[PDB]
Amino acid sequence: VSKGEELFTGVVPILVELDGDVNGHKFSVRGEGEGDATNGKLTLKFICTTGKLPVPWPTLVTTLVLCFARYPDHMKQHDFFKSAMPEGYVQERTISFKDDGYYKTRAEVKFEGDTLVNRIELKGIDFKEDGNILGHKLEYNMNSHNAYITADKQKNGIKSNFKIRHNVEDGSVQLADHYQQNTPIGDGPVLLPDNHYLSTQNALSKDPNEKRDHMVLLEFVTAAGITLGMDELY
């Protein structure tokens, strides 16, 4: 059994640190805020600490803490992310932008003291310098999306693939194809889920008093997709 989910019954401080390198354009992002897994809510503010972000903020949303998803009571058995805590998990992605370059990300999500920390290394390769990404042609928003989760028993974790649709400023859509894999950091017991999905919504905004390049982010993540019998009504 895992008492990791007991770490998320209250409001939990969050720290996010990202080092990025896209086509040799280097940058760093630091975010801070708090997560409320009981409601599936994230409240975060991110700052590009190196000045100007060379990619659009929306393209980093998926990279910048699924342990804060709201799993309904009758799905708590399928919450891999909290089960790996406090030792945490590694989250790896390839994000392939269609007709453009790709991100490779490696993150460690784990508790450091009282704070849930997401520390990411990102490399971007083969981008067009005036594509939608390096050219900053994407709208500052984030459509709602459902990401299917499947067990990865042969790696003792989960995997997921899903397509993010970024609205382009001309009205077209930029597809970002995500392939994701998570594996625990510690040796403890983890829950391997049945197939299900996470339903995510986002609101991106700006802080009036912030002169630095930044993103204020509200996010909701709720698990769904596991059929509910009357046996769980008990």
Side-chain angles (χ1 to χ4, degrees), residues 2 4-152 154-210 212-234:
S2 194
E5 85 257 39
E6 144 184 57
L7 297 171
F8 293 94
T9 50
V11 177
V12 174
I14 297 173
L15 168 69
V16 181
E17 316 183 287
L18 178 146
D19 283 335
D21 184 324
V22 176
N23 276 29
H25 310 276
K26 292 178 50 167
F27 58 98
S28 296
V29 174
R30 188 192 185 266
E32 64 188 20
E34 54 184 34
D36 172 12
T38 297
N39 288 309
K41 180 161 80 199
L42 302 176
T43 301
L44 293 155
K45 177 180 170 187
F46 300 92
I47 284 151
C48 180
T49 56
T50 52
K52 162 81 182 172
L53 192 69
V55 299
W57 279 106
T59 73
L60 301 182
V61 168
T62 62
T63 297
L64 300 166
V65 284
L66 298 170
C67 47
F68 288 105
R70 168 53 188 169
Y71 273 80
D73 298 337
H74 298 298
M75 295 179 188
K76 302 298 197 62
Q77 333 93 51
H78 313 271
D79 186 353
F80 164 84
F81 308 102
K82 296 188 193 56
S83 76
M85 295 294 155
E87 300 98 331
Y89 50 82
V90 172
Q91 178 161 300
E92 294 160 316
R93 288 212 187 89
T94 298
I95 304 172
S96 308
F97 297 86
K98 188 189 173 45
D99 296 338
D100 212 323
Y102 64 93
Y103 295 162
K104 290 170 55 81
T105 67
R106 180 178 188 283
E108 290 179 18
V109 185
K110 64 220 211 310
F111 271 93
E112 294 179 1
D114 68 338
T115 299
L116 189 280
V117 178
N118 178 25
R119 188 166 292 114
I120 314 130
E121 296 187 347
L122 178 149
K123 184 72 187 97
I125 285 142
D126 284 331
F127 284 87
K128 308 175 174 174
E129 284 291 336
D130 196 72
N132 282 322
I133 290 89
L134 291 181
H136 295 270
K137 303 176 193 192
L138 299 181
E139 299 186 345
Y140 186 71
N141 52 38
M142 190 73 182
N143 294 326
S144 307
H145 183 81
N146 288 330
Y148 207 74
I149 313 298
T150 65
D152 205 349
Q154 303 170 330
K155 296 162 75 90
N156 200 40
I158 57 93
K159 70 192 167 295
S160 173
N161 66 91
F162 58 92
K163 314 251 221 313
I164 294 295
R165 294 173 79 74
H166 295 294
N167 294 3
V168 190
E169 220 108 77
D170 67 355
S172 52
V173 156
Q174 170 76 54
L175 186 93
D177 202 2
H178 291 57
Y179 278 80
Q180 173 182 338
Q181 49 174 31
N182 293 58
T183 50
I185 287 173
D187 284 328
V190 305
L191 301 174
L192 279 140
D194 298 342
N195 285 18
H196 69 281
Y197 64 97
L198 300 180
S199 191
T200 306
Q201 302 83 32
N202 277 291
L204 311 193
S205 60
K206 300 297 188 171
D207 182 1
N209 307 325
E210 184 58 65
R212 291 166 296 173
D213 202 353
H214 74 287
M215 168 171 71
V216 181
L217 175 148
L218 169 67
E219 183 167 305
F220 290 103
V221 186
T222 313
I226 281 185
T227 84
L228 273 83
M230 290 293 300
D231 194 63
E232 306 76 328
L233 211 29
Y234 292 120

